Symmetry: D2
Subunit: 158 residues, 4 copies
């Protein structure tokens, strides 16, 4: 035996006033990497950018690549202020790994904050995570989790 359940959780919260618009001006900051997996922040950012475009966010300021990235993210927030973007997405990778034990479980987790600029007010935030089955890649579990979060942001954007 061995009991190895799989699971996924997501919590999101909307604050502020009226709707936030995906047609407004957006920035996607560098992710902070809170895992032992090198380059998880960069892969999380690439997956997130592609999902945002898919969901219809065309005007998305991004930061070319190149340490957990706290300073890069702070500096990118300042760059978004100077570019006069309305909303910045600040993301942290909480988990990104292929746990091997009795079987294989890819895990991925993220926390996302949407910050309205210039006032630096959080208008939405979300936390989600998922563990998969042995045949799933970590990248597919991460894409699912970020798809749920962005799908929720779009709905909660009202």
């Amino acid at each position: 035996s061995g009991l190895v359940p799989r699971g996924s959780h997501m919590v999101t919260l909307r604050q502020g006033g009226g709707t936030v618009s995906f047609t407004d001006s957006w920035a996607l900051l560098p992710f902070i990497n809170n895992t032992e997996t090198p380059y998880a922040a960069e892969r999380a950012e690439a997956v997130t950018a592609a999902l945002l475009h898919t969901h219809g966010m065309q005007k998305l300021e991004r930061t070319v690549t190149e340490d957990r990235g706290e300073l890069k993210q702070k500096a990118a927030l300042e760059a978004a202020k100077q570019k006069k973007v309305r909303y910045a997405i600040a993301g942290t990778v909480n988990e990104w790994r292929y746990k091997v034990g009795l079987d294989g479980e890819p895990v991925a987790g993220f926390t996302l904050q949407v910050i309205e600029l210039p006032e630096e007010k959080v208008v939405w935030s979300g936390v989600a995570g998922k563990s998969g089955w042995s045949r799933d890649a970590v990248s597919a579990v991460a894409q699912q989790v970020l798809d749920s979060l962005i799908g929720d942001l779009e709905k909660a954007a009202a």
Copy 2:
């Protein structure tokens, strides 16, 4: 200005070994309604039936708080019909919760039962509350789709 987070949760468990083929012979039992919403189980069974077709479960027998006798009746009907796997489902939540705004809520517990031994080969619990614009059935369909999607990820 209340804080009303939205959330979803899913936990699933595979207990036996070996494959579970969606091409084999399947049965979707009637659902048990554990809500104050009349016909929650009928709506759930119908949504569940449509999703299993989409996921490629082509041989799917169907037959015919409330519902506990009907489900007991239908698994024997399933065993006597020689279907290999029965899906026993319960509706844990199905309502449009009205408060500061609208939160549709739906939740379910599913068990796959291998026949004739009657061993639970997979089970899952999941639930989700969504935003005001969503209908309960759309939330329900999402929850049921995640469950069915997880079940499929078992060979």
Copy 3:
């Protein structure tokens, strides 16, 4: 027969600051009631107040009188117009005895701590629980609020 799992979940976030807490000046605002149970917000405030005392918060300012949102705005100014450093803002998300196959008490809450010079949220928590038939809703609520408060205490 029917399969009705019970469950609890808690998520908690320290939004920023490497500060501390607790023997400072604290305010427990009135709760917002996002349930169909009358008095849920008052009951939730009284349970939280007791738990806060139990967890050492000796200096705690309190406020006297889908509902309750306007009162909570008013109390945040009282703490603001007083010297209050930290304000606890709570919402009751769930408070009912769900009657299906069997009894199922359910309680859930969202809490934020606001640092009250400049209204910065330094901690937020959401938690909820459903119990077994022989548990009272109030006992389930106290367990959930105790988990949130004990977490807030450890996150400092």
Copy 4:
């Protein structure tokens, strides 16, 4: 500015109308260890045993130890030969102090209560918790197992 939420989750499921009694004959099997933490199953078993006694379960068969799957099967067989009514079969899913932006001790467990001799599962539970940096992993584990054992007690009736 990284976002590192802390969290705990528990899901339990009762299957069967019979009242299970803590004054009955019980066995605690060796845990299965689905982590990379040495001795995590042995420590899980010892915490669980002390919590069960605390919750009033005085007649508790235990196994002396030498991922543990064969040990758990053999102990289930020995419990049957001892004519115990209920065997607790546990898996350690997580037990580690994760070091990222800060420390997070993490523990998680899946428990099954098996009624013998029929080998029917009358209760099952999964729970997990990530804590704050000043917390020890064993304190997080003890909290998680106490929540599971407290739920089994309440679910069991008497």
